[PDB]
């Protein structure tokens, strides 16, 4: 058995246990992935590699993560591109920006990506996003085209509480987002 567990309720100006990429940085007790500026990408990874499955026993880990995040857009009509919680290879670096969310480079399935991402997508990219054109939560596997999505109404500048859980017995990943109002 191996268990890993951590909790951060206030970020330090020098979070040595985090790896920052692109424009990510901590300030005022928060982790800022992007400021409201054009064409930018910010990523923050926990520094320790996590043992997710074991090739010898074939066992896969059960895990649960919870975090609070906020999207603060100029108005409800100028908002992009979104945010993701992701699981990737240890050596992961930022991928394409814009609607690719800094995690994928194409809508075609790319097995060499080896990335699973839960997206909170705020902008409709006609080439792959769901046709209703609404903002949505989606589970992405090796592609920016989600395997499953759920419309979501963004509350601009409101703190969202998210819980993501993976049950190894069942192979089901579940996501839940909650606004207090």
């Amino acid at each position: 058995t191996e268990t890993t567990s951590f909790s951060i309720t206030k970020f330090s100006p020098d979070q040595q246990n985090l790896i920052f990429q692109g424009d990510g940085y901590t300030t005022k007790g928060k982790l800022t992935l992007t400021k409201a500026v054009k064409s930018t990408v910010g990523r923050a990874l926990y520094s320790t590699p996590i043992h997710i499955w074991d090739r010898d026993t074939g066992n896969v880990a059960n895990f649960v993560t919870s975090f609070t995040f906020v999207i603060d857009a100029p108005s409800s009509y100028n908002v992009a591109d979104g945010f993701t919680f992701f699981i990737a290879p240890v050596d992961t670096k930022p991928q394409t920006g814009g609607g690719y969310l800094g995690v994928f480079n194409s809508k075609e399935y790319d097995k060499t990506s080896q990335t699973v991402a839960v997206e909170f997508d705020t902008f409709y990219n006609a080439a792959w996003d769901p046709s209703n054109k609404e903002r949505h939560i989606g589970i992405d596997v090796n592609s920016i085209k989600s395997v499953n999505t759920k419309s979501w109404n963004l509350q601009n500048g409101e703190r969202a509480n998210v819980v993501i859980a993976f049950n190894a017995a069942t192979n089901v990943l579940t996501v839940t987002l909650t606004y207090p109002n």
Binding site: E2, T3, S5, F6, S7, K10, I19, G24, G29, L31, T32, L33, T34, V37, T40, V41, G42, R43, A44, L45, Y46, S47, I50, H51, W53, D54, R55, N59, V60, A61, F67, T68, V70, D72, A73, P74, D81, F85, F86, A88, P89, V90, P94, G98, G99, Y100, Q114, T122, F123, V147, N148, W152, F166, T170, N171, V172, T174, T176, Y179, N181
Partner: protein
């Protein structure tokens, strides 16, 4: 309080390596917004 839930079967073992790093990503493009994380907790048990 308003909430939204989504589930999908993801065969992690066939997708990701044995060891991984977890993290957050956010981007902007021709349009934009500030994306911030205010707290984060994690747990995993293998075996």
């Amino acid at each position: 309080v308003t909430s939204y839930t989504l589930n999908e079967v993801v065969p992690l073992k066939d997708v990701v390596p044995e060891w991984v790093r977890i993290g957050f990503s956010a981007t902007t493009g021709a349009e934009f917004a500030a994306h911030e994380v205010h707290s984060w907790s994690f747990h995993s048990q293998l075996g």
